[PDB]
């Protein structure tokens, strides 16, 4: 049977400069539109009607301050389809109401699905194990938990991260002030995975490069390697002795080493995603009850935990009126928390 399905399969899987595949039918439009929506919005589109903010090069923002901002809080969790009942097919209104945000987020979500299907599809054609696709589940878990689950637990898309450099920084600081997110052990595990992964990257790359065999005569050692050679290009035995004597322990199994390099950052990102799922519901690690009982009763008891809450209280009161304009917070000067003199 060589019907139209099989002929199409043939064409999709040709060895070309950019492999396409069946997964490419999903991947390429959705990735292209998500990127094009971000460039279109950061270049031309305002956030005046949803946030009270300028957010495009057209308005005078720079690369750090442009964003595609989230819709207004009054939209709730509306899909904000261009043909939906809010924009009613009007492209200009759609832009002013924040339709580009759901546009980028939804096409991005399906684009990420398509990239992971591409990893599976190419792996199956070339004949390798699909561990690259498995590792890519961690970026997907982060994207889905931060950009979809988190706002879906909150009141509206408005509280999702906006797509911009400084807008994401605001997201970090909101999470400190409102959620005490540094205190959350799921974030802590994520930090461990990311910093541990950067550590392993640096140390493995440096170790290989400084245990190389002399396999050529030049002072540039890069040339003395052939992709099809059978021999290891560096000495695992010497590397093992160096680290055992420097650090006490060392890798001895090169397959374990590289699985571990996969395991550490992937697991960290997965842990951080779980904590953000909790924050969707305000299920925070905000307090230690035992500390609060002591501190309420004993005005001489002070720790770095109590010092940080005072900082969080400053963040909430001083940023909330501007950051949440739909709430209409009016905080007179006299109610603002402030230390002496400042």
């Amino acid at each position: 049977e060589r019907g139209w399905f099989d002929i199409l399969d043939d064409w999709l899987k040709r060895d070309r400069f950019v492999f396409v595949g069946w997964s490419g039918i999903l991947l390429f439009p959705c990735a292209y539109l998500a990127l094009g929506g971000w460039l279109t919005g950061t270049t031309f589109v305002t956030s005046w009607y949803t946030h009270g903010l300028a957010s495009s090069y057209l308005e005078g923002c720079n690369f750090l301050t442009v964003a595609v901002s989230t819709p207004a809080n009054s939209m709730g969790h509306s899909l904000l389809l261009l043909w939906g009942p809010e924009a009613q097919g009007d492209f200009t209104r759609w832009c002013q109401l924040g339709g580009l945000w759901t546009f980028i987020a939804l096409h991005g979500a399906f684009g990420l699905i398509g990239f992971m299907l591409r990893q599976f599809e190419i792996a199956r054609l070339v004949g390798v194990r699909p561990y690259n696709a498995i590792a890519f589940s961690a970026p997907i878990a982060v994207f889905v938990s931060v950009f979809l689950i988190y706002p879906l637990g909150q009141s509206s898309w408005f509280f999702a991260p906006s797509f911009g450099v400084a807008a994401i920084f605001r997201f970090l600081l909101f999470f400190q002030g409102f959620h005490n997110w540094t205190l959350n052990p799921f974030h802590m595990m994520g930090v461990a995975g990311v910093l541990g992964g950067a550590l392993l990257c640096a140390i493995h790359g440096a170790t290989v490069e400084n245990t190389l065999f002399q396999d050529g005569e030049g002072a540039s050692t890069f040339r003395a390697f052939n992709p099809t050679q059978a021999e290891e290009t560096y000495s695992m035995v010497t590397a093992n002795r160096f680290w055992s004597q420097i650090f006490g322990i060392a890798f001895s199994n090169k397959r374990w080493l590289h699985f571990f390099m996969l395991f550490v950052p992937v697991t960290g990102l997965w842990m951080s995603a779980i904590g953000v799922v909790g924050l969707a519901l305000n299920l925070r690690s905000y307090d230690f009850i035992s500390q609060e009982i002591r501190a309420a009763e004993d005005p001489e008891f002070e720790t770095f935990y109590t010092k940080n809450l005072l900082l969080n209280e400053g963040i909430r009161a001083w940023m909330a009126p501007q950051d949440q304009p739909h709430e209409n917070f009016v905080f007179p000067e006299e109610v603002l928390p402030r230390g002496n003199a400042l």
């Binding site: 396409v20 460039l39 270049t43 031309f44």
Partner: protein
């Protein structure tokens, strides 16, 4: 010897064509006054 219009050709131009248009638009923005 080689073709001119390939998949690679399309992929190159769906990126490069809007890029140049956007760069001209952003260059014009540097002369806008309030």
């Amino acid at each position: 010897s080689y073709p001119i219009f390939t998949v690679r050709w399309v992929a190159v131009h769906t990126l490069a064509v809007p890029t140049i248009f956007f760069l001209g638009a952003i260059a014009a923005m540097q002369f806008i006054q309030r």
